[PDB]
Symmetry: D2
Subunit: 379 residues, 4 copies
């Protein structure tokens, strides 16, 4: 269960570099030099790293010197930068939003900040750029008219998309939904809301999703179903893997360590679909954990993914599972409901005896049990 | 606070006619004759009624005789039928889904059942047809590949949309999202997921949403924000009003009796946007309630809406509120971030002093308090 | 992974016998003869069966004949009856509550109904009697003063406890908490609330808990922590095992098929604590499932428990895990904070350098990863 | 709606003094001098203030000078200190717990820190001392054996209770339940769990609850029902008022601004029960809000409470409401189920015709609607 380059595992600098200052307590770890993160991640088998613009400054406040030290580390290790993003949430000026601040001068500041990091991302070869609208939203319904906020959100995203097209950066945008926290409610709270928003964009073709396991689970939604819809619409441009124990604060646990059963079926879907995107982890080591524990937790993300991958591969390869699937008539769902040359009257000429068929079973008990037994390594 | 025809209040037959058989107990009220519902609703000031195809049979099992008695009641009262829908969830053959049953013969049965009621809906003048995919989904991830289920869901909806176009019925379709119950997870679980799905339809122009207060709240989402996005995309084709106390079983309370503050801001948004759709109630009187209580609860829906409407009208008309809104700079959100003749270099030529502006306040405390005081009738 | 009598697995008649009529659809399975359930469960390795009084009537409406057929089946198989309970929730007269109905004649009916089944339970050798107050509660705050409802709840439970003492039945009572459903909120909504209530009872010594995995999880609570507190107070008199996917309707999935990670740690705690109670399953096979699927799902409960038991046994036996636990200083939590002969001034004479110790790590990353790897059968 | 001393309104220093640094951003307000808070709160009509030990140091790092400046402000204003508490959650040494840290030296540090502030609280006349175990818990099940953690929790609380008895401080302890945040799960997660824990204490008589509106609502529980049980057990020693929008991060909104309907019924219960405790607010002004907004938000807490108090007083005084309550037979719940001289055979001699009574209604529709109409100020 050792990670390989083909696994395309990657981490944000802000994950292993998180200082673990929470709502009720001080930081428990010192700032981590991104240069050390790049070397330690490379040594563990990570293929790539991602960053917010300001992550580069964790120990070096001079932006030019911080960028140079980052690139030197990437040169020495061969670590790739598949994606980058903007910090539009820490600085107090974004307290009311970034792209959707009431204050026009703040909105323009946000756009300019992204443009500078778009420039840097392209030079590093990042072909995907992530947008998490963490400050876009409100704590009360009177504070923000969401129709007008979406006007400004659409305006910012389409403006930036036209910018990258003018520069011929060849990049795609990935919107990261989140239902709440730090805002009482965040705009585009789920995979679905972001998909609906994307379809109104002038530049819709180059905008897709960066769904996060824990974010959809904060709303109690099924992450596997959401990823299925993202794949179905060809909008899975990025993914963020972690763990979460349902609707509460964003926990950012190690992938597989929240809803493990859902993680098993997520890996099953990613692998079986042949999705070729990076397996990116957006997690926090934990406030109990020291500097050495950090690398244990980074390894744990990749190892858990690899174990679940083997379990899911064995699950689908098992003749007992393929037999159970046929008993459930799962493959019959792929047959079109309507035939190619079939008219409305052709359809209404056929009848169905619903009373003869009312006692059909679908035998998911067997398939469900084989799935669980495979996950637990007992088959 | 007496309802008028312009209020466009309507009820489904299945709401006041619910027998109150739940997961753990028998029915507490006898079947209600739809003819009596039409007369009692008309007497209370309702403008319209809606129905599932099979609702018409509550006391009369002969479909032709049940339709005739329904139409006679509608004739005598002047009650309108703005919308109709299909029962694709009670009969055991739909236990695995209707449009997304594994069994092709069940999928075709579902389509034919809808087509018959589309025919009847058009004759009654319903110009909106509602689809709640209550059986579409699964209790376990192994049971249903959602990519393939969405293929079949899209296929059914587009097929039916082409049917109504061929018949020149002039109707629009309204998809009703729901996150769970009766299925462990339902396909298209939120307003967002349905919007994303609609955008892939061949007949996307004639398909929109029927969001339900309690359904989005079962996922902890902000119903006012979701309706705002539906309005923003011009997809609010129908609405279902009721109450809910967050993530639990679907409660179907009287509108305003769950999250009252959210109901206040929902009415504020519906009225201020000028949305002209019907105010439809999808609720249950309650298992403690007898046949007479039923009509008290129906009146309570309309009365609560009307009180909240007056409170929201007074809220926006208050000079103190308009002053607070200006202090918050709410109106400045409507100013485009980017000017019409502004280039990228024009934008990057301007700078922003983020440190000079870090202590700006937005003064939502005052606006929030005026909103609450208006809701509570104290202003 | 074959069940043995020492595993003490048991099922309620209402679990495998559930007809799968839900809030939105008809029953999909026919009534199941309890006689057949007793034989089929015995054949699968179940050790015991439990029942509501009225479960015995599923196919035989004559109570005396139904009891006789039940006892004959138990005689032939050697199946034990460790516990019994009362149906105080199906009949319409309980629509407002049973012990806490406003109507005094309903409260007295409830008490008499329990007394009759207490009599039958004793004859069958049940030494634990379960109380699920499923109708005790309200949908609105105005409907039920909970202080007065708890007066009546306490009165009923203490009255019944004195009855069983007068009869020398030697039984204990197990209160089953549930946060909601079918009521908007149920009285004694969690393990905690039931413990607090029990401590006010005259007969507190003979009253404890029947916690259910899915019930605490409907409130987002940690079932393992709750069982730990129940064990800590010596009040775990019964347990109900199933699965649930967080806050939504009560799902009654196969044990281990909801939050599998929590199920792993629950089995770890039950086994390591040496708790000797029965492992009772309160689940539903599923509405997609036919009569044959039912027994697959019953077997699946016991098999999943047994696999998790082996994984947890291997987890604790692993020297790597014991080493990780020592690194975390887990065993040091068992050392009393205060020594036996230590005064307040002795304690205040010692000082602690909090700044020297601020960077201590607890190394849960390693222990967490070993736990997950053991659950997944990879160690 | 102007606050008076009899309203007993109070605020923690940490509420209006919160700097609004959250999980994703910097502080937006400067540290607030507690001296200014005492004067500004007094001017607004607050009756009291409470504090964590370390709150006194917000602008003055010398503890003796900070205490002296605090007491001078209290002298000048006549503001009372009804309660105090300990910061056992900010400092990194508490990252694994305070009373339930694995490390014995940390547990003893926690106890000594509380003892010093118990000493100061007594001098200020605080007769209630609050314990929020915010760091007591875990993010994973392997990290903390809750049985052993509760041993140490009980040990600390009983030790401290014996200390205050030895000193003759005459104070009572108030345990503050919270389900999660900052820990994945917190020990004693609800009102119920704390009540059960209290009943095992040697010093149980002097230990009760400090329930917080938003904390129970984070678990989806009914705060009014929980307060009812606390009152019923005579354990409501303190209360914390704020607002929350269901299961998500702890929001700390202005009281009445989350679940307003529940706040209405909470005020109804507090006032009608005659509970004489302080009405304490534990809230945050909001990250959008500046130094002046802070006092608007403090006033808003008291004003919202007072408006709801008037609405609830008018509700109960309304003859229409008393008539509706009688129709519901609410008063009949107060009649004991069993008569004083009634034997088991006397009870079993009476019979109940359940079929004659199955169609009784309870008419909560009318009472519910009158309650909502009163809350909205329309009666
Ligand atoms: Mg996150
Ligand atoms: Mg992320
Ligand atoms: Mg509903
Ligand atoms: Mg509906
Ligand atoms: Mg259950
Ligand atoms: Mg149960
Ligand atoms: Mg709080
Ligand atoms: Mg508090």
């Amino acid at each position: 269960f050792q990670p390989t380059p083909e696994d395309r595992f990657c981490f944000g600098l802000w994950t292993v570099g998180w200082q673990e200052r929470d709502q009720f307590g001080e930081a428990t770890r010192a700032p981590l030099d991104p240069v050390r993160t790049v070397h330690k991640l490379a040594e563990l088998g990570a293929w790539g790293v991602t960053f917010h613009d300001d992550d580069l400054l964790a120990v070096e406040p001079n932006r030019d010197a911080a960028i140079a030290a980052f690139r030197k580390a990437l040169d020495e290790t061969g670590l790739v930068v598949p994606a980058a993003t903007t910090d539009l949430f820490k600085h107090p000026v974004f307290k009311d939003g970034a792209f959707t601040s009431n204050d026009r001068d703040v909105r323009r500041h946000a756009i300019r900040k992204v443009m500078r990091n778009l420039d840097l991302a392209a030079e590093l070869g990042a072909k995907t750029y992530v947008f998490w609208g963490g400050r876009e939203g409100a704590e009360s319904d009177a504070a923000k008219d969401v129709r007008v906020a979406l006007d400004r959100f659409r305006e910012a995203i389409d403006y930036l998309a036209g910018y990258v097209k003018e520069q011929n950066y060849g990049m795609r945008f990935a919107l990261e939904p989140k239902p709440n926290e730090p805002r009482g409610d965040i705009l585009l709270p789920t995979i679905g809301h972001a998909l609906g928003f994307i379809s109104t964009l002038e530049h819709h073709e180059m905008v897709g999703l960066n769904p996060e396991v824990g974010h959809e689970q904060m709303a109690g939604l099924n992450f596997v179903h959401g990823i299925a819809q993202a794949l179905w619409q060809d909008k899975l441009f990025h993914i963020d893997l972690n763990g979460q124990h349902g609707p509460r604060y964003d926990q950012d646990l190690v992938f597989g360590h929240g809803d493990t059963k859902s993680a098993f079926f997520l890996v099953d879907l990613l692998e079986s679909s042949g999705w070729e995107g990076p397996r990116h982890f957006d997690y926090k080591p934990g406030r109990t954990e020291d500097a050495e524990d950090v690398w244990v937790s980074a390894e744990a993300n990749m190892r858990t993914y690899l174990i679940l991958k083997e379990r899911a591969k064995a699950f689908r390869a098992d003749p007992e599972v393929q037999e159970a699937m046929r008993a459930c008539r799962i493959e019959e769902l792929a047959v079109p409901t309507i035939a190619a040359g079939e008219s409305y009257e052709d359809l209404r000429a056929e009848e169905f005896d619903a009373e003869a068929a009312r006692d059909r079973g679908y035998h998911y008990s067997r398939l469900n049990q084989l799935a669980v037994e495979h996950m637990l390594g007992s088959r």
